XYZ file of N, CA and C in Angstrom:
300
model
N -21.479 -114.468 -21.105
C -21.230 -114.770 -19.692
C -20.015 -113.952 -19.246
N -19.388 -114.272 -18.111
C -18.261 -113.539 -17.546
C -18.695 -112.165 -17.030
N -19.047 -111.247 -17.932
C -19.481 -109.872 -17.690
C -18.329 -108.972 -17.231
N -18.459 -107.662 -17.443
C -17.607 -106.662 -16.831
C -18.354 -106.120 -15.615
N -17.744 -106.147 -14.432
C -18.338 -105.655 -13.189
C -17.273 -104.814 -12.485
N -17.637 -103.802 -11.683
C -16.668 -102.932 -11.049
C -15.802 -103.730 -10.077
N -14.501 -103.506 -10.172
C -13.494 -104.028 -9.269
C -13.641 -103.361 -7.902
N -13.478 -102.041 -7.908
C -13.261 -101.202 -6.746
C -13.418 -99.763 -7.229
N -12.430 -99.299 -7.995
C -12.310 -97.964 -8.557
C -10.886 -97.794 -9.059
N -10.690 -96.910 -10.030
C -9.407 -96.320 -10.294
C -9.664 -95.164 -11.244
N -9.237 -95.350 -12.481
C -9.110 -94.286 -13.456
C -10.376 -94.246 -14.307
N -11.536 -94.001 -13.697
C -12.798 -94.003 -14.424
C -12.706 -93.042 -15.614
N -13.342 -93.416 -16.720
C -13.254 -92.693 -17.989
C -14.145 -91.453 -18.001
N -15.417 -91.589 -17.616
C -16.366 -90.479 -17.607
C -15.874 -89.358 -16.695
N -15.344 -89.772 -15.548
C -14.703 -88.885 -14.606
C -13.471 -88.285 -15.268
N -13.360 -86.966 -15.209
C -12.118 -86.251 -15.385
C -11.896 -85.474 -14.096
N -10.651 -85.096 -13.812
C -10.439 -83.985 -12.902
C -10.766 -82.767 -13.779
N -9.774 -82.022 -14.255
C -10.018 -80.906 -15.160
C -8.897 -79.887 -15.024
N -8.890 -78.842 -15.862
C -7.769 -77.925 -15.959
C -7.610 -77.110 -14.684
N -8.712 -76.508 -14.256
C -8.741 -75.657 -13.078
C -8.434 -76.555 -11.891
N -9.102 -77.695 -11.892
C -8.916 -78.818 -11.015
C -7.439 -79.207 -10.844
N -6.623 -79.206 -11.910
C -5.199 -79.503 -11.741
C -4.585 -78.447 -10.824
N -4.853 -77.174 -11.121
C -4.464 -76.074 -10.251
C -4.926 -76.368 -8.820
N -6.191 -76.756 -8.621
C -6.721 -77.085 -7.298
C -5.820 -78.125 -6.605
N -5.541 -79.248 -7.273
C -4.735 -80.330 -6.712
C -3.360 -79.769 -6.311
N -2.705 -79.032 -7.212
C -1.421 -78.412 -6.910
C -1.521 -77.499 -5.686
N -2.528 -76.632 -5.628
C -2.699 -75.707 -4.518
C -3.291 -76.388 -3.278
N -3.465 -77.708 -3.285
C -3.587 -78.459 -2.048
C -2.177 -78.828 -1.600
N -1.404 -79.365 -2.549
C 0.012 -79.656 -2.394
C 0.762 -78.440 -1.824
N 0.425 -77.213 -2.233
C 1.050 -76.017 -1.675
C 0.946 -76.058 -0.143
N -0.259 -76.299 0.379
C -0.569 -76.242 1.792
C 0.009 -77.498 2.429
N -0.647 -78.636 2.238
C -0.467 -79.797 3.093
C -0.166 -81.034 2.250
N 0.805 -81.824 2.712
C 1.314 -83.006 2.026
C 0.915 -84.290 2.771
N 0.269 -84.187 3.932
C -0.250 -85.326 4.687
C -1.719 -85.006 4.925
N -2.648 -85.630 4.188
C -3.997 -85.114 4.092
C -4.762 -85.387 5.392
N -4.897 -84.385 6.261
C -5.278 -84.589 7.649
C -6.802 -84.531 7.766
N -7.391 -83.349 7.971
C -8.792 -83.163 7.643
C -9.036 -81.948 6.761
N -9.361 -80.772 7.310
C -9.997 -79.656 6.649
C -9.488 -79.543 5.216
N -8.179 -79.348 5.036
C -7.436 -79.494 3.786
C -8.200 -80.240 2.689
N -8.461 -81.518 2.909
C -9.013 -82.440 1.935
C -10.479 -82.138 1.683
N -11.188 -81.940 2.775
C -12.596 -81.679 2.855
C -12.910 -80.385 2.079
N -12.150 -79.346 2.396
C -11.893 -78.160 1.603
C -11.623 -78.554 0.152
N -10.619 -79.388 -0.102
C -10.153 -79.686 -1.451
C -11.323 -80.138 -2.320
N -12.132 -81.068 -1.814
C -13.307 -81.522 -2.534
C -14.202 -80.324 -2.879
N -14.494 -79.456 -1.912
C -15.288 -78.253 -2.128
C -14.633 -77.358 -3.188
N -13.444 -76.812 -2.904
C -12.602 -76.026 -3.809
C -12.729 -76.582 -5.233
N -12.533 -77.893 -5.356
C -12.572 -78.557 -6.648
C -13.965 -78.494 -7.249
N -14.979 -78.903 -6.487
C -16.370 -78.925 -6.928
C -16.775 -77.542 -7.420
N -16.377 -76.488 -6.714
C -16.527 -75.111 -7.132
C -15.929 -74.951 -8.533
N -14.630 -75.213 -8.667
C -13.926 -75.054 -9.933
C -14.515 -75.920 -11.052
N -15.132 -77.051 -10.712
C -15.664 -77.977 -11.692
C -17.039 -77.474 -12.137
N -17.896 -77.111 -11.185
C -19.253 -76.640 -11.452
C -19.242 -75.407 -12.347
N -18.207 -74.572 -12.231
C -18.058 -73.371 -13.030
C -17.916 -73.796 -14.491
N -17.146 -74.857 -14.747
C -16.974 -75.379 -16.100
C -18.309 -75.807 -16.720
N -19.332 -76.095 -15.910
C -20.645 -76.496 -16.390
C -21.718 -75.434 -16.134
N -21.378 -74.287 -15.542
C -22.369 -73.316 -15.098
C -23.429 -73.971 -14.209
N -23.022 -74.937 -13.383
C -23.918 -75.562 -12.424
C -24.009 -74.651 -11.199
N -25.164 -74.668 -10.535
C -25.439 -73.829 -9.383
C -24.399 -74.114 -8.295
N -23.860 -73.102 -7.599
C -22.892 -73.322 -6.535
C -23.495 -74.218 -5.454
N -24.716 -73.896 -5.039
C -25.513 -74.666 -4.094
C -25.950 -76.030 -4.652
N -25.444 -76.434 -5.813
C -25.573 -77.784 -6.305
C -24.323 -78.103 -7.119
N -23.139 -77.664 -6.673
C -21.924 -77.900 -7.443
C -21.708 -79.391 -7.654
N -22.220 -80.220 -6.750
C -22.071 -81.657 -6.851
C -22.898 -82.226 -8.027
N -23.859 -81.452 -8.538
C -24.664 -81.746 -9.718
C -23.828 -82.155 -10.934
N -22.535 -81.806 -10.946
C -21.494 -82.407 -11.779
C -21.765 -83.862 -12.148
N -22.212 -84.657 -11.171
C -22.796 -85.976 -11.362
C -21.882 -86.919 -12.137
N -21.956 -86.856 -13.469
C -21.131 -87.566 -14.415
C -19.686 -87.610 -13.924
N -19.137 -86.425 -13.654
C -17.764 -86.223 -13.226
C -17.715 -85.655 -11.811
N -18.608 -86.117 -10.931
C -18.613 -85.644 -9.555
C -17.323 -86.039 -8.837
N -16.554 -85.025 -8.462
C -15.461 -85.120 -7.517
C -16.059 -85.467 -6.156
N -16.167 -86.762 -5.892
C -16.444 -87.270 -4.564
C -15.118 -87.422 -3.810
N -15.179 -87.426 -2.477
C -14.055 -87.662 -1.578
C -13.102 -88.738 -2.124
N -13.596 -89.944 -2.400
C -12.744 -91.047 -2.825
C -11.857 -90.686 -4.027
N -12.275 -89.745 -4.879
C -11.439 -89.257 -5.962
C -10.216 -88.548 -5.388
N -10.421 -87.599 -4.480
C -9.313 -86.839 -3.928
C -8.417 -87.779 -3.118
N -9.047 -88.646 -2.324
C -8.373 -89.712 -1.605
C -7.484 -90.483 -2.583
N -8.059 -90.869 -3.728
C -7.323 -91.526 -4.797
C -6.112 -90.701 -5.197
N -6.258 -89.440 -5.615
C -5.121 -88.730 -6.206
C -3.945 -88.649 -5.218
N -4.182 -88.274 -3.962
C -3.097 -88.282 -2.985
C -2.533 -89.703 -2.852
N -3.407 -90.708 -2.779
C -3.014 -92.111 -2.747
C -2.451 -92.614 -4.085
N -2.482 -91.821 -5.161
C -1.686 -92.051 -6.358
C -0.317 -91.538 -6.001
N -0.205 -90.233 -5.750
C 1.054 -89.553 -5.505
C 1.967 -90.344 -4.569
N 1.463 -90.749 -3.403
C 2.307 -91.468 -2.461
C 2.631 -92.899 -2.927
N 1.784 -93.519 -3.748
C 2.054 -94.825 -4.339
C 3.069 -94.698 -5.483
N 2.999 -93.602 -6.238
C 3.914 -93.217 -7.298
C 5.342 -93.172 -6.720
N 5.443 -92.826 -5.433
C 6.630 -93.077 -4.639
C 6.729 -94.574 -4.313
N 5.772 -95.114 -3.553
C 5.878 -96.391 -2.852
C 6.309 -97.549 -3.749
N 5.809 -97.570 -4.981
C 6.136 -98.610 -5.955
C 7.658 -98.621 -6.133
N 8.177 -97.518 -6.660
C 9.579 -97.326 -6.995
C 10.445 -97.354 -5.742
N 9.912 -96.862 -4.630
C 10.561 -96.886 -3.331
C 10.888 -98.322 -2.910
N 10.139 -99.304 -3.422
C 10.327 -100.704 -3.075
C 11.184 -101.396 -4.142
N 10.870 -101.166 -5.416
C 11.523 -101.789 -6.547
C 12.920 -101.216 -6.785
N 13.019 -99.893 -6.892
C 14.260 -99.156 -7.079
C 15.006 -99.549 -8.359
N 14.292 -100.022 -9.384
C 14.865 -100.332 -10.699
C 13.863 -100.004 -11.813
N 12.862 -99.193 -11.487
C 11.600 -99.089 -12.191
C 11.179 -97.624 -12.305
N 12.103 -96.791 -12.773
C 11.863 -95.376 -12.986
C 10.788 -95.190 -14.064
N 10.881 -95.983 -15.135
C 9.887 -96.022 -16.194
C 8.840 -97.087 -15.860
N 7.844 -97.238 -16.734
C 6.772 -98.219 -16.595
C 5.926 -97.951 -15.339
N 5.772 -96.668 -15.004
C 5.089 -96.157 -13.824
C 5.920 -96.409 -12.571
N 6.640 -95.381 -12.128
C 7.104 -95.322 -10.752
C 5.889 -95.243 -9.836
């Protein structure tokens, strides 16, 4: 009984970002720090491109990644990590370790 059922989302295991993908995330940070539109929408594409290459998946089906599909909510998540990585510690101010 009880069962494991999805909460919402967070750090899914099957999902990875990826090496090139880290570069992608950083080179979003290069441009824009308040994720407005094109930026992010771009970012998902940019990323999907970089991810599909790791699998030799067709560009016109880069989302075929499937298992590790960089959907919007993932990118939304990472920026919403970064600003929370502030917000937590920004409120506590005694919690440099144990995840700011």
